[PDB]
Amino acid sequence: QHSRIWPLYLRFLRSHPLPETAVRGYRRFLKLSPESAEEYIEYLKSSDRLDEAAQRLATVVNDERFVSKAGKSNYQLWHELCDLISQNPDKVQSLNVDAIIRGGLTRFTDQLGKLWCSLADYYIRSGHFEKARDVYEEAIRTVMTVRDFTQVFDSYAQFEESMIADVDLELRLARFEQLISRRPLLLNSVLLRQNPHHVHEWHKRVALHQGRPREIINTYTEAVQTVDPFKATGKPHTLWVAFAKFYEDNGQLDDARVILEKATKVNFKQ
């Protein structure tokens, strides 16, 4: 009878959604049913912004057992998708970033999916005066060779320029200037630093020294750090001689004798 009154209640609530959540609670608190729970969750998500949609989203992302979420889907990502859709612009009480971005940061296991959703959640949740730089620092820490960071930089540039069309307008102008200074040269350099680094590729070493020229010379120190303990396969003298010719432009006095004194005790087979 309840299996006939609850569908009849959902069909009778087709003109006034007052008792629909109540019948859903009487069926979900008196019957374990994954398909009915998903139907009631879509029912409460058919509301304005978060009218009982947040409650069903929390009850669906809770996932104590493993039978209810596996009812009409099996991907282990629909709960994160629902948490991100709750992190969307809505009218819930707070539900700001905590559990959703927390879970999407610890057990993401999806390339550029949870990162972009977390950047957008910190972008527009409520004002985001400080959460914008939060998303920017999050993109600076985790990039994993993806273009979510540059998209977040474009979103950061967007709003101040849009507001102007003034200190925030200049902030957006500088942000776009940095995004243009984010040319794919650093991307190709990171590519040559990720994969061919352990491959003992001297070509990647020369590309890294080329991407670190003698004007950001701390980046020549980074190129020496790349020439540092991670060695190569029968070509370390060329890298060391490049570093020596670079330090010779650096006065030819400091860090010149010491490096050769270290190179006399680097007589290993590598």
């Binding site: 009480q93 700001n96 971005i101 927390r102 879970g103 005066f129 400080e130 914008a132 939060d134 920017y136």
Partner: protein, 1322 residues
């Protein structure tokens, strides 16, 4: 010096002196100079002066502007400090004579603002700072508030920098006009009044400057006098108190922020001195926590996360604009967003390389300091500007995360710290770094944090004590290994401990969500200890300690010395026992494990485990989880600290949805009358008080100030409903007839018979009306009666509501259940929770209710079968609840509907001819008199049948749930309408209630004056909010604020933080209207007068005033009340066989002799109770009884021989009270304990103590003078009862003037009775 001060008091100011010499300022000057200043502020000397009534008799009444001096003001301040440290009223004398109080306060301010080390020393300045802190903490008294208003008002912003004041006016434009009005007011005052107003307005900043200069005066490593440290601590404490008070913080926050004292105290070497400045460091940390609290000083409302982030982003934006517009070197900092430079690391990296001049120019552009003149270098250290700018612009963590980052356990660095866990020897001269709760709080977060921290620190004392006891009994010695030379009951040597689970923590939080560990102990003890250890269950608090002893084996241990070095205390950590493992590897018909090993799973602190792991990873520390060698268990009744702290953390993590008319009331501010019934917009007009009033005369007399208008004129027509107006002092009284409940006359519902007075009637009415109702009930004022009447009225007027009953002990719950059992309350809706010896005639626990529900369901099924047989329905099948409902709705409802259509759509005969339940009611109907009567009788039979069907439908859940726990949950959640429990049980199971879904509409609490504040707040959040609002409809609390308060184990937390302050007492102190019961009904009026002076019109009920048993004198006793002065016995007065176990041999022996005489004369020894002021005195009386009576047949045993603190709520016919202390008055000075000790006697009270020491006590004088209105020597009648109390006795009046003479008389009487009688008890 003591004899000199005593002679000075007796000559000039001592009470009990008819004539003293005239006032002399030289007396006060000499006293100050020789006793206070000479003795280095002797606490004993100050206490002697304060007890002698020095301020109330000589200083205050004789204070005048021409005679006020530094010595006089210092003596007044020291006396006030002594009164505050002693917890006695200190402002009564000032209120009696407020004439020179403004000049006194102005001179105190002038002295406190004196340049350091001048006319006033640093000790006098620290005492003055403490006095000013007490005064600012005394904001309830009008006289001090009218003087502190000028120094804590918005005009005090005249002490802030002009640029900062302009920035404030620009941020708050609406305040600017207000300031203008203030300036206009300054025009109207003469030069002297304007100068005084400016001095008061700048006093706060001047004291801040003096504190900053004193703080700079401390050397880094060089020797420094403690006076500067004590002054810095007191000044920080006063600042913290001011910052925690919204009335004091509102304008003081801006002055403190402009002063930058937090940056200085963070930059001073005093905080760098590990030994001298530790407590000062805790005070500065608390001051930072208060100065950064997320609350708007102007609006008073707590700031949300969005507002905090917006404020931080606006600060960052202003700093970036200033940098970009005035500093090229930080232009990139001006170009990059807030977060990129909003970390302390980014702020230091960008701003650290700049010069002190650049940071000074930034601080000038940021409105922090004066503009740096061109060509000038800054005079403040670069570190000062750097720390200021970083602390202003760096990211700050929330208070919720700060609380959630705290473990629930105190470790080895906290268990022994006297700065936060002060011992029982805390005198109160130094300060303690713990919050205090007196009147108000900033927000719900402030109150919850204060309560939780205070509870943790209070339990920490008992934890450290028990741990030291177990380790000292264990005998830990060296042998590189640790050898246990002894045994400990609650502590077992660690056989194994291994962390087996480190769960991944939920994201965002950086700590593991749950950490488990398996611990094996060696149950090589007596089988009693084996059972005591095996009795540990889930939720048990166990403590893992790792001790590396330093002393060789066999070295004696000293309890007086530091236990830490004595036993080698290394680490102390907590854990919660999850369960004992079996022989099947499962954490557990409990099984009987074999062998002497016991393995238990325990949950470790995830926050503390995270801290330990981080320390090991970063600083190379050793593994703290691999060094535990001992595990300690404790008493479960004293091991609930973790549960209360967890309830606090959760109730601080939820939205804390309390009633909209109760939030401000709890917060300590606003209108105290905003929760009354007359001020509630949802007040009910007509209310059914059917069983409240017994008769119409009692109803009319319950409202002397109301005119009763009855809806019926017939005096035979006067169950009554009362409708109130809203001329307007008329109550519409309507009599009613309770519907017939069947043909059984025994089924008529019982009625309450207690003839309530007008005050009880007003209290019951306020309880039946929405809002908060406070009942102040004297001892025996009928609190249980009014409570039961209110509960019955609420259940009867609102059957769809649920009542939550909250008590402090099981005795109040047993009494409330016994009182309810006499009223018309169905037992199927009442429920009793507890985790105990049955005190009631019925079982109100879950199991008793389940058995009763099952038995009633069986009876209902049998009655339904009988009704079916009487209706002629065939079928031998036994019916269940569902089938019972089906058969009802099929046959009984149908027949009732047909009969109703027949006779209710009309002859008196056909009403019975059409009755379908004649055979069903044949065991019991119709009279044939009138149609109405027969119709009502048939309706009553149908109502009984409907009640049977409703009870069956309600009990069907018992067939729906087979387990008893599920049945109890269903009865507690839905079936029950009134659920009762204790404050402790509620604080332990609040999470279980909220998770299971228990709901309630009305809350009734008794003994609220004995419940802790957190223990009174914890019942208000026992369920979730309803659609955004709290479901609570009425909050009634009944208690006695003049009675004993909640117990604080280590009295330091009460002396310093006032943790014993109950919620009811605080709500009364705010000014919340309460109804004071003024009619006692258990003890004689002559004895009740010994405490009725402390109650509001506490009188005597008619039964006690006319009852004969209250006018009969005590057999063998001249008067029903006598105070016995007991002088010294064999050269000793008070005694101390043990430290603090005070006894008095003469008084104890005299009580023993009085009990012996009362026993030999024919009085019932069980009707006599023995009370004493100390546990040692009670034990001395017990040993004396054991050595004097023993097996004597003519002398039995007393009902109770204990303390007054342990006899609360109890009483006897006759009470022998011992005031043994004779050197100091002591804890008897508490008016509540005195009222309790004088309000425990039913017919006779005999007190033995030093009359003179207490007569000099001012606080007990209202009882002491009435007690001294009779002789201090025992007037007895050994030749005897039927004597009247006032009629002169017809027997011999014997006057025993001493305890030895009383003992001699007792020996003679006993030797005569043993020869003249013979008892045969065997």
């Amino acid at each position: 010096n003591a004899e000199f001060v005593t002679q000075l008091a007796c000559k000039y100011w001592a009470p009990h002196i008819k004539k003293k010499s005239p006032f002399d300022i030289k007396v006060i000057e000499d006293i100050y100079e020789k006793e206070i200043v000479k003795s280095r502020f002797a606490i004993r000397k100050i206490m002697l002066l304060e007890f002698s009534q020095y301020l109330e008799n000589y200083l205050w009444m004789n204070y005048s502007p021409e005679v006020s001096s530094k010595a006089y003001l210092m003596s007044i301040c020291c006396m006030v400090n002594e009164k505050f440290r002693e917890n006695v009223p200190a402002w009564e004398i000032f209120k009696k004579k407020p004439d020179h109080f403004p000049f006194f306060f102005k001179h105190i301010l002038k002295a406190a603002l004196a340049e350091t080390d001048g006319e006033f020393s640093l000790h006098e300045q620290t005492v003055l700072l403490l006095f000013l802190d007490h005064c600012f903490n005394s904001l309830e008294v009008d006289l001090i508030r009218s003087q502190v208003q000028q120094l804590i008002s918005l005009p005090m912003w005249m002490g802030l920098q002009l640029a900062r004041l302009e920035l404030e006016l620009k941020k708050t434009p609406k305040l600017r006009k207000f300031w203008n009005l203030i300036k206009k007011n300054d025009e109207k005052m003469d030069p002297e009044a304007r100068e005084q107003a400016y001095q008061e307005r700048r006093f706060l900043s001047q004291l801040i400057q003096k504190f900053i200069s004193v703080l700079k005066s401390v050397p880094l490593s060089e020797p420094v006098t403690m006076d500067k440290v004590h002054y810095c601590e007191r000044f920080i404490e006063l600042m913290i108190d001011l910052e925690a008070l919204l009335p004091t913080r509102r304008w003081f926050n801006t002055i403190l922020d402009d002063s930058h004292l937090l940056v200085h105290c963070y930059l001073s070497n005093l905080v760098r001195r590990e030994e001298d400045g530790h407590l000062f460091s805790q005070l500065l940390d608390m001051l930072k926590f208060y100065t950064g609290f997320e609350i708007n000083d102007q609006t008073g409302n707590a700031l949300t996360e969005n507002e905090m982030t917006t404020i931080h982003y606006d600060r960052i934006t202003s700093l970036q604009r200033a940098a970009f517009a005035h500093f090229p070197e930080l232009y990139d900092f001006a170009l990059s967003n807030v977060a990129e430079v909003d970390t302390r690391e980014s702020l230091v990296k960008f701003f650290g390389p700049l010069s002190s001049n650049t940071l000074h120019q930034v601080a000038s552009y940021l409105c922090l300091l004066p503009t740096l003149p061109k060509n000038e270098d800054t005079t403040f250290d670069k570190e000062f500007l750097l720390e200021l700018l970083v602390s202003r612009h760096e990211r700050r963590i929330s208070q919720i995360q700060q609380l959630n980052q705290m473990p629930l356990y105190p470790t080895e660095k906290i268990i022994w710290d006297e700065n936060i866990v002060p011992t029982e020897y805390y005198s109160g001269e130094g300060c303690l770094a713990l919050p205090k709760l007196n009147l108000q709080f900033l927000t719900l977060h402030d109150y919850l944090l204060r309560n939780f921290n205070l509870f943790r620190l209070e339990s920490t004392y008992e934890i450290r004590q028990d741990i030291e006891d177990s380790v000292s009994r264990m005998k830990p010695w060296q042998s590189g290994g640790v050898v246990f030379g002894g045994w400990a009951r609650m502590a077992q040597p660690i056989v194994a401990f291994t962390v087996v689970e480190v769960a991944k923590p939920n994201i965002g939080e950086n700590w593991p969500t749950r950490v488990r560990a398996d611990v094996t102990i060696n149950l090589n003890v007596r089988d009693h200890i084996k059972d005591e250890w095996e009795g540990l269950r889930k939720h048990d608090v166990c403590f893992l300690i790792t001790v590396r002893p330093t002393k060789p084996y066999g070295t004696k241990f000293d309890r007086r010395r530091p236990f830490i070095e004595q036993v080698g205390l290394v680490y102390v950590r907590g854990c919660e026992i999850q369960g004992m493992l079996d022989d099947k590897g499962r954490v557990i018909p409990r099984p009987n494990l074999r062998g002497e090993s016991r393995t238990f799973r325990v949950f470790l602190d995830p926050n503390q485990y995270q801290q330990d792991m981080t320390n090991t990873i970063q600083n190379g520390a050793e593994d703290v989880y691999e060094t535990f060698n001992i595990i300690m268990r404790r008493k479960p009744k004293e091991n609930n600290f973790k549960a209360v702290l967890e309830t606090i953390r959760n109730l601080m993590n939820t939205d804390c949805v309390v009633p909209d008319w109760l939030h401000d009331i709890i917060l300590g501010y606003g209108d105290p009358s905003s929760a009354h019934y007359s001020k509630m917009p949802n007040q009910i007009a007509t209310l059914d008080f059917n069983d409240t009033f017994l008769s119409i005369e009692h109803l009319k007399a319950s409202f002397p100030g109301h005119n009763v208008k009855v809806t019926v004129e017939d005096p035979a027509l006067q169950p009554f409903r009362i409708t109130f107006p809203v001329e307007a002092k008329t109550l519409i009284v309507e009599p009613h007839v309770i519907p017939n409940r069947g043909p059984y006359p025994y089924n008529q519902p019982k009625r309450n018979t207690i003839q309530f007075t007008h005050t009880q009637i007003e209290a019951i009415r306020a309880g039946m009306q929405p809002g908060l109702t406070m009942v102040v009930g004297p001892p025996g004022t009928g609190k249980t009666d009014v409570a039961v009447q209110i509960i019955s009225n609420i259940y009867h007027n609102f059957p769809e509501q649920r009542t939550l009953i909250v008590t402090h002990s099981n005795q109040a719950l047993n009494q409330l259940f016994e009182k309810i059992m006499a009223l018309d309350i169905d037992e199927r809706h009442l429920l009793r929770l507890g985790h105990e010896e049955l005190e009631t005639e019925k079982d109100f626990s879950r199991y008793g209710r389940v058995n009763y529900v099952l038995a009633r369901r069986i009876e209902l099924l049998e009655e339904v079968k009988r009704l079916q047989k009487s209706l002629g329905v065939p079928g031998d099948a036994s019916y269940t609840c569902e089938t019972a409902g089906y058969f009802f709705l099929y046959q009984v409802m149908s027949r009732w509907e047909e009969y109703i259509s027949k006779v209710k759509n009309p002859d008196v005969t056909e009403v019975s001819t059409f009755f379908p339940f004649h055979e069903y009611f044949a065991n019991a109907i119709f009279k044939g008199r009138s149609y109405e009567e027969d119709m009502e009788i048939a309706e009553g039979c149908f109502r009984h049948i409907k009640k049977i069907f409703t009870q069956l439908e309600e009990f069907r859940a018992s067939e729906l749930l087979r387990s008893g726990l599920d049945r109890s949950k269903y009865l507690l959640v839905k079936e029950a309408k009134i659920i009762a429990m204790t404050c402790t049980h509620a604080a332990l199971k609040r999470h279980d209630l909220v998770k299971l879904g228990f709901k309630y509409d009305n809350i009734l609490m008794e003994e609220a004056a004995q419940i802790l504040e957190i223990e009174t707040f914890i019942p208000l959040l026992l369920q979730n909010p309803q659609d955004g609002f709290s479901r609570l409809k009425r909050w009634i609390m009944i208690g006695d604020h003049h009675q004993l308060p909640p117990v604080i184990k280590n009295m330091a937390f009460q002396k310093y933080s006032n943790m014993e302050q109950s919620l009811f007492t605080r709500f009364v102190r705010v000014g919340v209207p309460t109804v004071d019961l003024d009619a006692q009904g258990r003890a004689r009026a002559s004895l009740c007068n010994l405490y009725n002076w402390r109650y509001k019109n506490l009188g005597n009920l008619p039964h006690v005033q006319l009852l004969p048993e209250f006018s009969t004198a005590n057999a063998g006793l001249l008067y029903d009340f006598q105070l016995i002065n007991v002088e010294d016995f064999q050269g000793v007065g008070e005694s101390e066989p043990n430290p603090y176990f005070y006894q008095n041999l003469g008084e104890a022996e005299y009580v023993v002799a009085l009990f012996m005489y009362m026993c030999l004369l024919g009085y019932p020894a069980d009707k006599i109770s023995i009370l004493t002021t100390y546990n040692g005195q009670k034990h001395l009386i017990r040993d004396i009884i054991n050595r004097r009576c023993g097996n004597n047949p003519l002398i039995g045993r007393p009902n109770k021989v204990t303390t007054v603190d342990r006899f609360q709520g109890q009483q006897n016919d006759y009470i022998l009270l011992s005031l043994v202390r004779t050197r100091a008055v002591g804890h008897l000075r508490d008016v509540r304990r005195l009222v309790v000790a004088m309000s425990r006697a039913r017919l006779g009270l005999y007190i033995f103590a030093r009359v003179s020491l207490f007569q000099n006590c001012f606080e007990l004088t209202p009882a002491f003078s009435q007690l001294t209105a009779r002789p201090l020597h025992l007037h007895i009648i050994p030749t005897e009862t039927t004597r009247k109390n006032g009629e002169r006795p017809s027997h011999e009046v014997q006057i025993i003037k001493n305890m030895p003479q009383m003992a001699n008389f007792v020996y003679n009487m006993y030797m005569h009775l043993i020869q003249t009688t013979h008892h045969y008890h065997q």
